[PDB]
Amino acid sequence: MIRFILIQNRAGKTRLAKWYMQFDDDEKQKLIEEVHAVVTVRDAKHTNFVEFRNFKIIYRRYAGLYFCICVDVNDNNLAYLEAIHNFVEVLNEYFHNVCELDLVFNFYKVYTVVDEMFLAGEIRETSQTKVLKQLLMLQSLE
Amino acid sequence: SKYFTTNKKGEIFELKAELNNEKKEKRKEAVKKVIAAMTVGKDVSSLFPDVVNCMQTDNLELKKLVYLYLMNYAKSQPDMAIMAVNSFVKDCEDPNPLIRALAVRTMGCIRVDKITEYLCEPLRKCLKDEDPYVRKTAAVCVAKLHDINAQMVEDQGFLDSLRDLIADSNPMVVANAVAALSEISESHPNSNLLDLNPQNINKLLTALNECTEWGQIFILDCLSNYNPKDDREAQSICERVTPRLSHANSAVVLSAVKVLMKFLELLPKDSDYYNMLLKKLAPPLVTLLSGEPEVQYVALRNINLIVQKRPEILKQEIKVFFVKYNDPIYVKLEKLDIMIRLASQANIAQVLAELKEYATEVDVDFVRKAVRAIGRCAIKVEQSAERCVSTLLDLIQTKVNYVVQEAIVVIRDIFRKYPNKYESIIATLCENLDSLDEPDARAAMIWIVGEYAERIDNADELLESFLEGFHDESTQVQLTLLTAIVKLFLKKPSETQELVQQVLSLATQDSDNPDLRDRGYIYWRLLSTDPVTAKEVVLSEKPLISEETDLIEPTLLDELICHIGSLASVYHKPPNAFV
Amino acid sequence: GMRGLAVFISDIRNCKSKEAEIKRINKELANIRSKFKGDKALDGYSKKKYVCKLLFIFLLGHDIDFGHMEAVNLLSSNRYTEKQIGYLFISVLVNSNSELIRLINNAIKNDLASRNPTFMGLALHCIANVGSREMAEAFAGEIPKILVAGDTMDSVKQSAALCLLRLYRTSPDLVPMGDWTSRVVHLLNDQHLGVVTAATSLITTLAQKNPEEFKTSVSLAVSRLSRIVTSASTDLQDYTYYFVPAPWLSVKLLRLLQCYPPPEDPAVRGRLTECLETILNKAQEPPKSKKVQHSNAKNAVLFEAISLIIHHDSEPNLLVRACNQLGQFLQHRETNLRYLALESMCTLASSEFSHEAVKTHIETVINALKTERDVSVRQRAVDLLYAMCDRSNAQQIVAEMLSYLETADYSIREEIVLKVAILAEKYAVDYTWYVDTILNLIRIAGDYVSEEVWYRVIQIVINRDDVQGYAAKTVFEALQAPACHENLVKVGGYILGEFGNLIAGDPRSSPLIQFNLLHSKFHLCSVPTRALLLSTYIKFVNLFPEVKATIQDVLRSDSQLKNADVELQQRAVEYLRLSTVASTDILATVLEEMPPFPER
Amino acid sequence: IGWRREGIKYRRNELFLDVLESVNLLMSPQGQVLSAHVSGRVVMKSYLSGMPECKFGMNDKIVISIAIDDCTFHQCVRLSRSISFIPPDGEFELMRYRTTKDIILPFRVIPLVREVGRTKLEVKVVIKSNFKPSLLAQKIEVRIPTPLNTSGVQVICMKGKAKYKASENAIVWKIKRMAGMKESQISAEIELLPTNDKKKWARPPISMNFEVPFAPSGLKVRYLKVFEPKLNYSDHDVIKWVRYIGRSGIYETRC
Amino acid sequence: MIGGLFIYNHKGEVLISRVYRDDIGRNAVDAFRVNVIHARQQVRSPVTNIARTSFFHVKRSNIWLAAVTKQNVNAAMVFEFLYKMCDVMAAYFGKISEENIKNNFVLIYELLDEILDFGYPQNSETGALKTFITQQGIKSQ
Ligand SMILES: O=P(O)(O)O[C@H]1[C@@H](OP(=O)(O)O)[C@@H](OP(=O)(O)O)[C@@H](OP(=O)(O)O)[C@@H](OP(=O)(O)O)[C@H]1OP(=O)(O)O
């Protein structure tokens, strides 16, 4: 299962964090640092997969933000690598060419998008079409 | 794909609005915010045209910010800074010298051959500029220019253009042309730097009087290179340098000392200058251990070589280098080395007291090096030996484990230096056989039973105590124990054979170490062949270890004296170690 | 949106100091209460927003010790945007206060009990995001009900399935295998694949403790997978991603099937084989898009299929086919595929039905390593060559390992040296090969070589001895590089001291040349090596009298005779005076040939 | 005060410092540090007349399920480089700490495991002591777990001694002593009765115990200066021992 | 001379830097990070030689000030230079800490171009620099 999902910038700063496991805030902070240290040190010659504590991390870099899913060792790497991209395509449609600050000012909507596509450590909805239609129905409400 | 690459919104677009906003106070804030982004690795390259247009300004603080931003892309990609070259040259016959220099320094920190063209002549004018902050920055710029590849021959209307500015009415200016000169000179053909020399020394060592903190040093360092001829030439050279208890201790001080020591090949005490100069040099060096901790380390690493060369200089000054508890480990250790390099026949007095101090402290590493130090005290100076061995015996009584073991090892080397002298102590030494974990110490005792086997009767049961766990044992100990027991036998046949079978049989038949196996055989083939010729070959009067421990080969030491300022002076290594 | 939020955030970015940040944060916290305490009650807009700011502050890393009641009242709003923020706040700041937990549970009670699927949605997610024991006790019995009921909407269904799954991971006892099971199973045949996708996750976790209860799924999972993978261009347009139909559900179905042994119904087995054969064929088809997303999606499916094939371990055609497809990935610019391919092959090399298939790609594994850049990938290439190494390979493997080492980085050296030694010991054809390997191992990377290993290579040159001359020359030609490291000087100097005579005949390698070569290492070596070289040196006095005085004056010297080290000075004196005192017969008796070692 | 009562006296003014650290590791079979942390405490045993003011000094290492970097001092400690206090008399805990960075891993465990079909498993494990050769580690144990369906086992090892314990499903290897910068090997041929019948062997990690005379965190004590104002003795009069004991905690290598 | 000047934070991250010679790339920054900042059981010294490259450093609270070359430089100078830079910085914004460094990126780049040309230590005592320096330092307490 997914243990957590992070979106972070080159600088180490977190832009989203969704946890599917019990951690205290100290720990959540430690994990957020640790992930930054591992992922900002790798050029494009490295794989998108790396073992991390007793789990592993799938990651991809879109400009200056790192999308990162931490998952169980036995989970499918490419499945998650592409889940990330499917998610980024949704984000990109939902914010009309998404940029780092979109995730800042609309941070609470970002969680809406996530819970659409991921719940309880598993992929929920993959269809870009359905997700956007729900999201825009959600936006029209009061 | 190009997700987050969006150009038509986000932080880039926002900052672009402010770089274009018509109020220069909001534009200053843009350029800072862009400088802050580069520094966090954000690709602000998109903005470069809008940030270059902020240079079309009266406001000083603004241009200043743009140059900073443009200086960041000099080193990052020198191609990104090829695109504001047309209005650099413009900005160096400017009103305000603050701007003039600011186009020269930024032109010379760029690294590709599109730079040769636009700069060959504007720099020609910044050296003829009537403001010295520009000639300070042109001088350093001429140096920057050589850096980029090729010799060039218009370059030999540039070397000479620099030599002009060594003669100048500003110690900041001249002292930098000097720095330029020696550096550019060390991509080496021989006869570079114009030997219009007798004159230009007078210009350097006047500049040095009025000079800045750091101007002096580029001077001092560029002198030493040259060998005077005869002889009293040397004299006043050295009578000018005298006031170096200057600003930038120790770079100033030590860059002097460098010169003040290549030129100590005089007919010395025909005139007591030699005695004048050497009285001088003690005080300033001493002062550098008040400076700061890092600066010290360097000082001491030079002092170390200096003390080996001209030992007279600091002979009287040992208390200078006594250890402060709060000194970093590395100042402690170099302090210690030098404390023993100066341990006169007379100052062992407190020097020994000053090491009983150290071996009782908590820094376990430094403690150990301190009781070694007492060792090489007993060894350097003969008359301390008796008192060193006393101190050592005291430290061993404390029962502090690490101190004991270090001491035993040191006591072994003392017995070797002063044989047949400290023998009653052996009995008191074996008392502590209970608590010797470390290989070295075990090997020392073992060697000490040695060697003095015929003195002591229990000696067998002692040496036998180790045969139980001959393995588990350091191959150094194994070796030492092999040799130890063939000694025992070579003075007590019948008596020993009880055991000596075991030990040759364990090196020969049981040991995987081929070097150890060798040694068992070699001894087996001596003993079990010739009962007297063996005694000759082993128990011979070995020569006395003379204190070679810390000591540099005298030729190499002169190489390192001809370097005293530098890196090689800290590593105590020639520059062949890094080409 | 909420302007006051956007301002608070813009003020926080414009801040030019962590001081000023913290000031602008304390300012907002005062303002927020204030207004929470204030006599004038607030509009929904304002609660909603101020809660939202509190969440923001929290996410910057600062503490928040109020707001919780205000977040809870938003739950009871009939305004979505208000509920949403209340639900988000409690999902992100979980507080202990059992007064609030009871309220939260009421809100969830209502929202669930509403028939509004947006509100049902928020409710189910809150539960699922928080998973509190108390939440389980309130709702664990209701979730299965909502999941199955004929009337609840697909999106709710999805959200309820994964909700239930979490309730089952944190509170299994509140999730007995009731009566809903088969109706859960039937979800596998839903039209909405998002729903199918949700259920598959649930069922997978449930079928790991409860295989018999869900063993019905196998058949329906095979049916779905096969309809899925054979679907046309214009099928499942929603769930097609870069021309690949339903990659994530495919993976998932394939994974559910790894909960069970092969389907027991022949026809089913067959549909499954057809299925996998198909997946395996698609890997052989060229990409429909040059975008890496297409092949990553396709391969995700492939690899999960490969996993299923391994785990069943029952179709040898498929295992072989899987090997070969893996092997073609080894020659790919995609570091990701190279990596996964080595990974899966390593598994595959421990099953009989595939071991020999894997051996087949030895050459490709080696060529991939020989030119790899990612260290993790090199690492795993080397692990595969160890996995696939036997008698038929040993030598090809060892030779390339050695070859690779000559120009290797450092990252990888240590591991390979260890491996080379180990495979050498196990698979040595003859003594000579072994010695040829070890000596060369030591020449190239002796800094990593064990003592046990160099002890052995010397110790071996006795018993089967006819290698001595080879050893002697090899050690020699090695030593005569300016490069040259310590354990070489050790084995080098031990061997030449003992069998240097067999190469002293050549004038390219005379006693004097041998000696000086050795001595040009001496003063650079650690003291035990010099102890060893000192023994070499006197053996030289014995074998070659042509050079006994060059040697004696290196022994008579100060740096040997007055040596700080006890062993160095002991030997230099013992040996100096051996070459001086006694006979020549004695000298030759004492430093003869040196007997051979015993056995194990 | 209130932790140190008035008018204490001893003929012989001593103090002892025990640095006691526990090192934890998880590591991949390729040697990637997946997680690692040190838990420590300095224990001071002080017999000092009067009310001594103490100034303590150490190196850079400590800064002041998921391990967090932390440091906690005794109630007596005052902060400003250096720590200063009037210590309680006899034994107490001066400080407690945890570090996660730049840990010195006393051993590298390198596993070589080889599933020959479903009937034989070949296991080799090499351990490298990764510290100064002059220092010695003791009470070494390597514990190599075996699968449940293990028919039997034959084990060879050149250093120490080892043996298979079936109640614990484990090969247990022991080494009384081992110096730094050495290497050691064990080999094992394990025989397998094939149940399974689903599920590859889910492989638990190899674990070690050991003890070393240094702080795996790198902590070094540099000074401890005693200044008693009223009384007769000075820092020069105070006898001082330091000990470092580094123990293994959960020190694991996946195979 | 001074061929590379980097300032790290308590985790070996390059907070801000300026190269002055192309003779040193990334390979420099890493060596110093790996062997000095994240050093294990090594004999620390203010000067280290790895990859045939020399490294000077001082430490301020939690900040690493480094200085770097492949030349045979006046060692003594570097440290003298470095203590004055710290004399300069602290007189523009007080405590020399990761935060205060971070607040004053614009300013610090500016002291650097001024205090050091192509690596040569220049007139760098506070009062002289009030002319050549445009920025003020964001002091916090
Ligand atoms: O930012 P201010 O100028 O102080 O205005 C704030 C406030 O914004 P914040 O509390 O978030 O800073 C309100 O919300 P927004 O609508 O700007 O989001 C609000 O204005 P509304 O009442 O229109 O919501 C309110 O009251 P006021 O209307 O009196 O300006 C209040 O100002 P006070 O602190 O003076 O109440």
Residue numbers in the entry:
A (entry chain S): 1 to 142
B (entry chain B): 4 to 582
C (entry chain A): 9 to 608
D (entry chain M): 159 to 222, 240 to 255, 261 to 435
E (entry chain N): 1 to 141
From the paper:
Binding to PtdIns4,5P2 causes recruitment of AP2 to the plasma membrane, which induces a conformational change from its closed cytosolic form (Collins et al., 2002), resulting in activation of two key functions: binding of the two most common transmembrane protein endocytic cargo-sorting signals (YxxΦ and [ED]xxxLL) and binding to clathrin (Jackson et al., 2010, Kelly et al., 2008, Owen and Evans, 1998). The best characterized and most prominent site of phosphorylation in AP2 is T156 in the linker between the two domains of μ2 (Höning et al., 2005, Olusanya et al., 2001, Pauloin and Thurieau, 1993, Smythe and Ayscough, 2003). We show that this phosphorylation event starts during clathrin-coated pit (CCP) initiation and increases throughout CCP lifetime. μ2Thr156 phosphorylation favors a new, cargo-bound conformation of AP2 and simultaneously creates a binding platform for the endocytic NECAP proteins but without significantly altering AP2’s cargo affinity in vitro.
Recombinant T156-phosphorylated AP2 core (Pcore) with >95% stoichiometrically phosphorylated T156 was produced as in Höning et al., 2005. The structure did not differ from that of the unphosphorylated AP2 (core) (root-mean-square deviation [RMSD] of 0.56 Å over 1,717 residues). No electron density for the phosphorylated μ2 linker was visible, suggesting that it does not bind back onto the rest of the core and that it is statically and/or dynamically disordered. The phosphorylated μ2 linker is largely invisible, i.e., disordered and accessible in the open+ as well as in the closed Pcore structures and thus should be able to bind NECAP PHear domains in both conformations. “Pull-downs” and isothermal titration microcalorimetry (ITC) show that the PHear domain alone binds Pcore but not core in solution with a KD of ∼8 μM. In these experiments, the Pcore should be in its closed non-cargo-binding form (this work and (Jackson et al., 2010)). Additionally, our ITC data (Beacham et al., 2018) also suggest that by being able to bind closed P-AP2 in solution (Jackson et al., 2010), NECAPs could play a further, accessory role in CME by binding and stabilizing closed P-AP2 that has dissociated from a CCP membrane and so inhibit the P-AP2 from rebinding the membrane.
